């Protein structure tokens, strides 16, 4: 049970020169792990087979060394269609550890997310629940907050966040924390602010409104 | 090419197994020891068990030695892997991949390259069910905000997916689809997909086509102002 | 409109310096227990096909010399 630890956590680029990335086993491997290209959603593929010589139609520059602990892995020119996961993987010890994950971003620049609070319906008033949505929307990076107020009372645990992929597009991000209530306990108050906290804004973003107001 | 099918996607309540055919393809069979591995979205990979393909070489992983068995179909080159007493922490994409077999007379591999799509597998007590879409859809016009977005609100259905398209996918600007982010109360995962429109587009209505089918349920909504 | 807690008599309420007199009935000043401020109003029935029209009543009680002009919209 050799322990994979990659040392970058994750990364982001905005496309460009070497991407180098980094893999150490807990002993001594010697050459005899591979690397791979888990993209979202799809099967992982192999990049590198045993710690380099570019397995079977990789195109011109993922090389890679090693041998034999702290493993290395190069995205030398970095063509921005391989931000995927990657992983290091040992194989000649059972039982077989893979690494950690190694999500790869783009690095446009920090940006505010356009903070949006919807209202429960009605027709969720017509289930017996609640459920207030914030938005957060068009940002980056993922490094944000979110500070639930039940006229102004900090809440949180009947929260559901939920976090969109990177943006082939424009590279941004999208939030939405879910505040699933009772109705009861929606009834019990009005004042529904969302207080979101995102480097690209300036402010701890309070986004509100009244229950009936909408 | 040296390929697998694997088939196919089900999800088991705590029950019985979800064994996988792992159809091989392209390449002989009796020189290649298929493994599988198991990941769990969001997280990392779980190699869990390699036959060798022929004389079998079980090599289960540890903390389920056990629970899983592993078969071989040498006859049409599919594999097989089962689960016993089946659990919630078998929310995993079942890949099957091939090690190479650690004989004398197979080729040198270990890097798996056959490798296998995946294989939606959640370990799931919910019921299948419809989304509960709540929506806002306003007219971008809520306090005074130029573009003021909307979105639905797609929740508790099981199993996955919803499929979301707004106004039959005519507004593809601003689609953010959030994930299923599942629910610890029932087990029906949440989503919703938004977009930003602009006030001025407060005369259009814009309809997301919730629809899932493998509850085979249809939803389309849109919601206004209040006067 | 809700003419509340003037002393003493009386308001004189107008709809737009007059100019609604349709509609108009003054309800007399109902006289506060609590504080000896009594409550008048003055109101119109108008139809639907005026909405894009603000109704000012022109409330001006002379004996504290305030004069009070107002309108409220819909909540979008």
């Known amino acids: 049970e050799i322990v994979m630890t990659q040392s970058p956590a994750t990364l982001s680029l905005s496309p460009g020169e070497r991407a180098t990335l980094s893999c150490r086993a807990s002993?001594?491997?010697?050459?005899?792990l591979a690397w791979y290209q888990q993209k979202p959603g799809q099967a992982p593929r192999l990049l590198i087979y045993?710690?380099?010589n570019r397995a079977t139609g990789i195109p011109a520059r993922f090389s890679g060394s090693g041998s034999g602990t702290d493993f290395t892995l190069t995205i030398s020119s970095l063509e921005p269609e391989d931000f995927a996961v990657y992983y290091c993987?040992?194989?000649?010890?059972?039982?077989?550890?893979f690494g950690g994950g190694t999500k790869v971003e783009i690095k446009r620049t920090v940006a505010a997310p356009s903070v949006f609070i919807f209202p429960p319906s009605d027709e969720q008033l017509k289930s017996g629940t609640a459920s207030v949505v914030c938005l957060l929307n068009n940002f980056y990076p993922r490094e944000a907050k979110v500070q639930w107020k039940v006229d102004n009372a900090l809440q949180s645990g009947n929260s559901q966040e939920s976090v969109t992929e990177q943006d082939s597009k424009d590279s941004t991000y999208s939030l939405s924390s879910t505040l699933t209530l009772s109705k009861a306990d929606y009834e019990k108050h009005k004042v529904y602010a969302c207080e979101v906290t995102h480097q690209g804004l300036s402010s701890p973003v309070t986004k509100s409104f009244n229950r009936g107001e909408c | 090419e040296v390929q697998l099918v694997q088939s196919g996607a089900e999800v088991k309540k705590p029950g019985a197994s979800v064994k996988v055919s792992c159809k091989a393809s392209?390449?002989?069979?009796?020189?290649?020891?298929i493994s599988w591995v198991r990941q769990a979205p969001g997280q990392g990979l779980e190699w869990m068990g390699s036959?060798?393909?022929?004389?079998?070489?079980?090599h289960y992983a540890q903390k389920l030695q056990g629970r899983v068995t592993m078969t071989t179909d040498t006859s049409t080159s599919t594999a097989y892997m089962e689960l016993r007493s089946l659990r919630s922490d078998d929310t995993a994409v079942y890949y099957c991949?091939?090690?190479?077999?650690?004989?004398?007379?197979?080729?040198?591999?270990?890097?798996?390259?056959?490798w296998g799509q995946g294989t939606l597998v959640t370990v799931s007590s919910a019921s299948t069910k419809g989304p509960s879409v709540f929506p806002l859809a306003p007219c971008s016009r809520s306090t005074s905000e130029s573009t003021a977005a909307l979105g639905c609100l797609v929740k508790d259905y099981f199993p996955e997916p919803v499929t979301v398209s707004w106004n039959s996918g005519a507004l593809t600007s601003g689609v953010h689809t959030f994930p299923a982010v599942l629910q610890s109360s029932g087990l029906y995962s949440l989503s919703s997909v938004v977009t930003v429109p602009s006030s001025s587009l407060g005369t259009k209505t814009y309809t997301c086509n919730v629809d899932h089918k493998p509850s085979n349920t249809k939803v389309d909504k849109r919601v206004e102002s209040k006067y | 409109?809700?003419?509340?807690?003037?002393?003493?008599?009386?308001?004189?309420?107008?709809?737009?310096?007059?100019?609604?007199?349709?509609?108009?009935?003054?309800?007399?000043?109902?006289?506060?227990?609590?504080?000896?401020?009594?409550?008048?109003?003055?109101?119109?029935?108008?139809?639907?096909?005026?909405?894009?029209?603000?109704?000012?009543?022109?409330?001006?009680?002379?004996?504290?010399?305030?004069?009070?002009?107002?309108?409220?919209?819909?909540?979008?």
């Open positions: 993987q040992q194989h000649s010890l059972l039982p077989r550890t």
């Open positions: 002993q001594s491997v010697s050459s005899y």
């Open positions: 036959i060798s393909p022929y004389t079998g070489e079980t």
């Open positions: 392209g390449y002989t069979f009796f020189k290649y020891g």
């Open positions: 045993d710690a380099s």
């Open positions: 991949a091939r090690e190479g077999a650690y004989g004398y007379r197979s080729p040198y591999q270990n890097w798996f390259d056959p």
